[PDB]
Amino acid sequence: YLTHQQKVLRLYKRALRHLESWCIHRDKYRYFACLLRARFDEHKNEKDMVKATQLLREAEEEFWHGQHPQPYIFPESPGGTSYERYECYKVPEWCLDDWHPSEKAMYPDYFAKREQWKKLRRESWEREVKQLQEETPVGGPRTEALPPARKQGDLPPLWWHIVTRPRERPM
Amino acid sequence: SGYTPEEKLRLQQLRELRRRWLKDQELSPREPVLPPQRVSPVERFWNKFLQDGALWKNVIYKTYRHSIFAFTHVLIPVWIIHYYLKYHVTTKPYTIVEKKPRIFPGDTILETGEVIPPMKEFPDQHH
């Protein structure tokens, strides 16, 4: 979940972003961005948690009533115009194993070096499994975070599909 | 409110692997190693001809390509279309139906040399 600290920061970011949409012009935004910062300052160091929640809970209602019906969204962010625009050009790396040798003959250096990575992934797998079979509690993982490499020469467990992932502009 | 020491170490190790993988995606100067292609003699004449980007030289190339296009995509098709319409499509009844041309007072009909009487006198409007 989100602690009370995280929920306040998120609302502050949303409040400024929607406010930026209403203001448009930078100078006007730089004015109401400071005034809105002040409203987050008059209660910066509240002590009573119950009072703090009632302040946060009331801010959300004012945010919902005041949010821009059509807020600005970055082009590549969820709901943005360019969101997932290049997901059709993102091919995985395993499709190169199905290439004809004639196609591979056009890139002798790339595929020679790609073979080295496949060897590196293949040699380090059995060690990665153990690294997770020992740090895991008796029952099973209680969180989604993976541990780093502990011994020199080892690679971070479960690294292939985050390291070899397609680029953001594949073509 | 930041990375734990374990998380920072993993990000660095993932970062160093990711950068090297991205580096390997670069092509060497030889690549792509294209197999031999039978170069047409005509294109050879233009490779040397276009060695220097002269304004007068590329104009000849511009006129050459357009002239070829005007022959393979306008002249040959219109020959086929005219032949098709001339001897196959206009030889059948009611295929191409032309709206009869307009006749105005005072016109002469080419087919029979007839003359259409002019209109009655316009009384007056001035304005």
Partner: peptide, 12 residues
């Protein structure tokens, strides 16, 4: 900088 474009086999 002339990177390698990963695409599915087009030979077949």
């Amino acid at each position: 900088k002339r990177l390698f474009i990963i695409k599915p086999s087009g030979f077949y």
